[PDB]
Amino acid sequence: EEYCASAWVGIDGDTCETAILQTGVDFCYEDGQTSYDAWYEWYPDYAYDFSDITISEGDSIKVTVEATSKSSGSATVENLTTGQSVTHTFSGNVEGDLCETNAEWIVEDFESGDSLVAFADFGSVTFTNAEATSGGSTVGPSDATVMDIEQDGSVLTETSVSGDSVTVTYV
């Protein structure tokens, strides 16, 4: 059986239903082996992989999404450990308009097959230098709404936030 999880930053998707500009990394485990990949997505379009960047356990990754308008922007994944940086620019021609009402740092159990992918035990994921820009000013996650995963009567995560970080721990 294969277990996975993803970590990403994004704009919209919670109270704004028409689009999500997001970028992140998937981590999967299957019979003594692991698989990692970086991807971008402007929902409702499909997620696409960044094929020119290598992701390994322990690497420091910096992810950023920027909106230049409600229908244009970019997604960037930088592997600080190796010095690699990739950016996908959405010049327009997108399938959904952003509302620009949600900014988030998320660890997700994504859909795959008939339901959600079996959820991997990732230990803990901490987003540092967690910042969102609104009206030209930067804000941290202090006043953010905290969310956790609960499936089949089982709480699978515990999340804690600080003035500049978000930590998600597997339960």
């Binding site: 277990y3 996975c4 981590f27 910096k62 998320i106 540092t128 820009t133 995963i149």
Partner: protein, 32 residues
């Protein structure tokens, strides 16, 4: 907190967000 079937983390609700960034270390994964 708020529970969901698929998202865990922090969500800011407001207006005018044009950039979101974060830095993390790629975790060690095992069977859930």
């Amino acid at each position: 907190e708020e529970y969901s079937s698929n998202w865990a983390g922090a969500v800011l609700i407001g207006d005018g967000y044009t950039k979101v960034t974060g830095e993390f270390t790629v975790p060690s994964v095992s069977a859930g």
